[PDB]
Amino acid sequence: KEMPQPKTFGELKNLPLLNTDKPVQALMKIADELGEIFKFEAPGRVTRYLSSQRLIKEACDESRFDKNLSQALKFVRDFAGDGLATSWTHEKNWKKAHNILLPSFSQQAMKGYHAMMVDIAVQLVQKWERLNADEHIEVPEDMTRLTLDTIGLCGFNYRFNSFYRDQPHPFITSMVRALDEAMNKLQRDDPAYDENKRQFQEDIKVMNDLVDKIIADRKASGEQSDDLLTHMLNGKDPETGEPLDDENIRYQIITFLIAGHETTSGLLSFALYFLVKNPHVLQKAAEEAARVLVDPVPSYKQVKQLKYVGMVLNEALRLWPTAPAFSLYAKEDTVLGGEYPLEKGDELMVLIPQLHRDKTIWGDDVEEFRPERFENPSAIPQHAFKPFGNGQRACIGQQFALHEATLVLGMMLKHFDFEDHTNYELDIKETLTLKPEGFVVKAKSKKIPL
């Protein structure tokens, strides 16, 4: 009945607890101490962090709870607009874009993106083939170059050419800095933050200008590509009969870059981390890659056959889900778990990494990396595994993210042996997403041509 709450700071309540550079990890430790639910209070804000499958399966009942914009998402909305990830369910543009975009994100639609994904994946493999002896790989940096360029090419047929650069494309610099400002605002306004505010407006303009220009260029040329921009310029919502307007198309493209690039590169980085830390698993994944990927270029069908690589990726998502939380609100007064009364509008946060450590679902070995947990997908209870969110507001990019990550991890394991030459100590850097900071490896080529 009475809900636990972490230590307070006078008038600031719990807010200074977030003034740390690893806040998800801090909230996980609080959940370890306090259990499946705790109240978190700040000036003008009350939320409740959920950690157990028992309570989260109720919060995922869409008849009782809808997606809420967390404060992080509210700040991202200042540049993602009413794109899919930062719009309320009841906003006309959510269901409209949802209906238009769902068919272009299906498993069937990955067949059309596959060639462009391969284009960037081959660039990654060639970069590593061309490293000199005793040079090493900066794993999240290269994974970020890959996922960013893949979304750019599949999203709107634009080449950021990240593998030709040390300093990223100006669009990426402004996007990352806008995401940085969004996160820093969460932890803080006085006169000192005026420079950050001016820079934020400048970063927003940089993003809008490039994306609006590409949309305008495409409309003028009339050319058709296999990208999401072409689908959005031609698609009509069956319900309203309307197409997306140019401004919303821009917000969707920005959304694809934000929501997809760091989550996916984080997944690849964590997966490779767990592989080099678990040589029996790496051997098993590498066997499958060599057996399945029998052609110099992987095909769409071959990627679907990388079952164990997929298990590796799901187990990496279990331990470190790279979009680590989502937010809900009670549609009406309701009681959570038979003991927590909630009033209409009350907010909930789903702490995904804690959910994925619920021993009552996964057993005592929750911290061990064992892809075999996912050997048979049916053994996983409902709402125990939620790296892609919930229900109609789940990740629309799930099939894209997993197809890219399976393709690329498969190619990495086919073409190279990996050495954890520094005995890397896991250090998880937190933005709005999670990644293993400073993770480096050496790759020895297996000399298999492309």
Token duo for residue 131 = 């490293």
71 vs 305 by CB, closer to ligand HEM: 71
**Interface with a copy of itself (CB under 8 A), residue from 4, 35, 103, 345:** 103
The amino acid present at 66, given as its one-letter code, is D
CA 74 to each of CA 172, 197, 327: distance values in angstroms, whole numbers, following the listed order? 21, 16, 11
**Should residue 341 be labelled a site residue for a copy of itself when binding is judged by CB under 8 A?**
no
**Interface with a copy of itself (CB under 8 A), residue from 132, 167, 221, 382:** 382
**Interface with a copy of itself (CB under 8 A), residue from 295, 379, 425, 449:** 379
298 vs 387 by CB, closer to ligand HEM: 387
Active-site residue identified among 263, 322, 406, 433: 263
395 noted as active-site residue: yes
Burial class of residue 108 in the structure, from the number of CB atoms within 10 Å of its CB (0-12 exposed, 13-18 middle, 19+ buried) = exposed
Backbone angles phi, psi at 359, to 5 degrees: -65, -25
Residues that bind ligand HEM (CB under 6 A): 67, 84-85, 98, 151, 255-256, 259-260, 263-264, 267, 321-323, 326, 387-389, 393, 395-397, 400-401
Active-site residue identified among 156, 388, 400, 439: 388
12 vs 102 by CB, closer to ligand HEM: 102
Q: Taking CB within 5 to 8 Å according to partner kind, which of ligand HEM, a copy of itself, none is near residue 263?
A: ligand HEM
Task: Report angle CA 41, 45, 49 to the nearest 5 degrees.
Answer: 55
**Interface with a copy of itself (CB under 8 A), residue from 190, 280, 423, 447:** 280
User: CA-to-CA distance for 371 and 373, rounded, in angstroms?
Assistant: 5
Q: Taking CB within 5 to 8 Å according to partner kind, which of ligand HEM, a copy of itself, none is near residue 256?
A: ligand HEM
Token duo for residue 12 = 């600031």
The CA dihedral of 142, 147, 148, 150, to the nearest 10 degrees, is: 120
What is the nearest approach in angstroms of ligand HEM to the Cβ of residue 165? Answer: 21
CA 208 to each of CA 131, 181, 216, 220: distance values in angstroms, whole numbers, following the listed order? 36, 17, 12, 18
Backbone angles phi, psi at 63, to 5 degrees: -75, -20
**Interface with a copy of itself (CB under 8 A), residue from 360, 427, 444, 446:** 360
Is residue 316 within 8 A of residue 435, CB to CB? The reply is: no
What is the nearest approach in angstroms of a copy of itself to the Cβ of residue 284? Answer: 6
C-beta atoms surrounding 103 within 10 Å: 11
User: CA-to-CA distance for 227 and 114, rounded, in angstroms?
Assistant: 11
**Interface with a copy of itself (CB under 8 A), residue from 70, 147, 278, 433:** 278
Q: Which residues of 384-398 are buried (b: 16+ CB within 10 A; e: fewer)?
A: bbbbbbbeebebbbe
Q: Taking CB within 5 to 8 Å according to partner kind, which of ligand HEM, a copy of itself, none is near residue 422?
A: none
The amino acid present at 111, given as its one-letter code, is K
**Should residue 102 be labelled a site residue for a copy of itself when binding is judged by CB under 8 A?**
yes
**Should residue 340 be labelled a site residue for a copy of itself when binding is judged by CB under 8 A?**
no
Q: Where are the beta strands (DSSP E) in 96-247?
A: 137-138
108 vs 161 by CB, closer to a copy of itself: 108
388 noted as active-site residue: yes
- Which window, 23-31, 74-82, 102-110, 258-266, contacts a copy of itself (CB under 8 A)? 102-110
Q: Which stretches of the chain bind a copy of itself, using CB under 8 A?
A: 61, 63, 98, 102-103, 106-108, 278, 280-281, 284, 287-288, 304-305, 308, 360-361, 363-364, 370-372, 376-379, 381-382, 391-392, 394
Q: Just list the catalytic residues.
A: 263, 388, 395
